[PDB]
Structure 1
Amino acid sequence: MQLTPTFYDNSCPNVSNIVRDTIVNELRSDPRIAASILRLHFHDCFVNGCDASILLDNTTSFRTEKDAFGNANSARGFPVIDRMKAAVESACPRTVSCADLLTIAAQQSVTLAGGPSWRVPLGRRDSLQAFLDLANANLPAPFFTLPQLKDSFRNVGLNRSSDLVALSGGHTFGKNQCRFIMDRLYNFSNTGLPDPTLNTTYLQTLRGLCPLNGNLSALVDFDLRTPTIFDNKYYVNLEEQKGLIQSDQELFSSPNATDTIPLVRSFANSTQTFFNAFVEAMDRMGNITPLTGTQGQIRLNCRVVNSN
């Protein structure tokens, strides 16, 4: 069946508010949680669809996706998702799937951070297993070239250039570890020189935050203009060659960016245009091979498959 935003309007009408309240409370002690949650949803959807497979803990039958390159010592916010699920289960027992919960949490996170507000289609169910090997092959890496980023998205059904450019806008907030930009800073492409597409003045600031022999786990803001606000500033940075990671700047500086540049220019000069495109791309991503109707289950605890 098709996903619909009205799925819980009768069975659990306040699920949206329960999710929002949880994030609002968490934001007070962790201003980064909204960014972390949106990212969890993205990593869920790109591996076998938005089926909450990423939330499963390791078992003797399958390995957790939390160990995947890109998730290990990177993804976070799991206990917050647990709190959300516990609250929803008390109000609406065995009604809301973890897959749908993570979807609503991602939308609310964007809205709470100043982004657009919309009702996400719902009705997804939870997977019976995790897919580590698939996660290690499906998640795009920061060193991918533009054509490789395009292939990665097309691989899961997001075959429009707007999907890539709009969803990349999720880097309008959140943090990135020094380790993922060390090459751009000191030795790009085995050349011994920094990435020529990185603004030289910005390069100095970044080198100060990520010293050659420093802490590779140190965090840097993805968006130097409004680090915690969900807006179109991410695109303005690209125009000034101030995109933080390689995959960011390529949207504007790659020799294959013929079709992405116009979107970047458009999004950088119109919040409304970017927000509309982001909502459309988000709903498309949220529709990647979902389990519906009778497939999968409604997990009682997002970390484990139901017993019986």
Structure 2
Amino acid sequence: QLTPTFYDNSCPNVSNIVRDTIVNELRSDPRIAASILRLHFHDCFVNGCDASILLDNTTSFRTEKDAFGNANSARGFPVIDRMKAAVESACPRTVSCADLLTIAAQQSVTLAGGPSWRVPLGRRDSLQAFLDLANANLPAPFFTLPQLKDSFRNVGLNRSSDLVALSGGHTFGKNQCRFIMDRLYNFSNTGLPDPTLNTTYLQTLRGLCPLNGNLSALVDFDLRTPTIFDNKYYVNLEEQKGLIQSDQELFSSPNATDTIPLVRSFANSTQTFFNAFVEAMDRMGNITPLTGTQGQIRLNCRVVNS
């Protein structure tokens, strides 16, 4: 099974190399940490964290990069290539892309001001990509709470704490206007904005995302601290200021009897949130991994070794 010390003998400096790469990238692109965490999440929700999302097209299988939840959204692939190259130089054919991305996600969270911990390691890389599975498994911003719960349970995360804590990943990063247009102007064919969206914030968002405007324009997930990893995400939800439907559903859904207290607990205490986030992150990181001699230690994260 996975262990945090997997590379302590074979590549003791892997975490440091990953950190250095992100630190350097953050200077030119302050959004990279958020982007990397999102990559790990979308890796894990499709056949487990096996770096299948990093694979490019082949004539035998399509890339997950063209999934509805990844196309024109997922980013940072070149950055992963960079750290992988650096790590391959430090320790040839040792660290899997799956593990590398997991470490990158944790380091990204820490660099953004979040908790610091050692992630379990020992994952191996997939021998194929799963586009159809990605389209079926990746949750969408328009999901209701029951659908969000179903999506998490589908991949192995049964706990509402998993859902509420991991959703905290939206404490930083960007979101396209495209995904909230319904909430702002015509929610569920009601001809009205989403009633669970704070009316003052509604005005602000309408100004950033006017009807018939640029749907690709970006908006911050957390209006309090856009680039800092903290519990402000939950404080927002309590005030009906979650950006996308799936965020606000955690606090306002008729099915939120179990998630409301979790949202409050995380909003009330940074420690409680950070603790739950690490716990949920490691559980997500433990979703159907390839281990031992299963799969490979991919040399180029974009292609299967031949």
Does residue 191 of structure 2 align to residue 225 of structure 1? no
CA–CA separation in structure 1 for the residues paired with 2:149 and 2:227? 27
Pairwise CA distance, 1:82: 0.2
CA–CA separation in structure 2 for the residues paired with 1:254 and 1:246? 10
Pairwise CA distance, 1:93: 0.2
CA–CA separation in structure 1 for the residues paired with 2:87 and 2:263? 39
Deviations 1:53-84 (A, max 9, x none): 00000000100000000100000000000000
The count of aligned residue pairs is 306
CA–CA separation in structure 2 for the residues paired with 1:205 and 1:260? 27
Pairwise CA distance, 1:189: 0.3
Query: Matches of residues 1-308 of structure 1 in structure 2 within 5 Å?
Result: 2-307=1-306
CA–CA separation in structure 2 for the residues paired with 1:12 and 1:32? 28
TM-score by length of 1: 0.99
CA–CA separation in structure 2 for the residues paired with 1:114 and 1:211? 33
CA–CA separation in structure 2 for the residues paired with 1:282 and 1:303? 24
Deviations 1:274-301 (A, max 9, x none): 0000000000000000000010000000
Deviations 1:201-255 (A, max 9, x none): 0000000000101100000000000000000000000000000000000100000
CA–CA separation in structure 2 for the residues paired with 1:257 and 1:162? 12
Deviations 1:101-144 (A, max 9, x none): 00000000000000000000000000000000000000001111
Deviations 1:32-62 (A, max 9, x none): 0000000000000000000000000000010
CA–CA separation in structure 2 for the residues paired with 1:161 and 1:78? 30
Give ranges in structure 1 of 5+ residues lacking alignment.
none
Secondary structure of 1:90's aligned partner: helix
Secondary structure of 1:223's aligned partner: coil
CA–CA separation in structure 1 for the residues paired with 2:160 and 2:53? 26
Deviations 1:255-283 (A, max 9, x none): 00000000001000100000000000000
Pairwise CA distance, 1:154: 0.4
Pairwise CA distance, 1:6: 0.3
CA–CA separation in structure 2 for the residues paired with 1:31 and 1:269? 27
RMSD value over aligned CA atoms? 0.3
Secondary structure of 1:220's aligned partner: strand
CA–CA separation in structure 1 for the residues paired with 2:143 and 2:24? 36
Deviations 1:165-184 (A, max 9, x none): 00000000000000000000
CA–CA separation in structure 2 for the residues paired with 1:217 and 1:23? 25
CA–CA separation in structure 2 for the residues paired with 1:296 and 1:126? 5
Pairwise CA distance, 1:153: 0.2
CA–CA separation in structure 2 for the residues paired with 1:208 and 1:145? 26
Pairwise CA distance, 1:162: 0.2
Q: Extract structure 1 runs of 4+ deviating beyond 4 A.
A: none
CA–CA separation in structure 2 for the residues paired with 1:75 and 1:238? 24
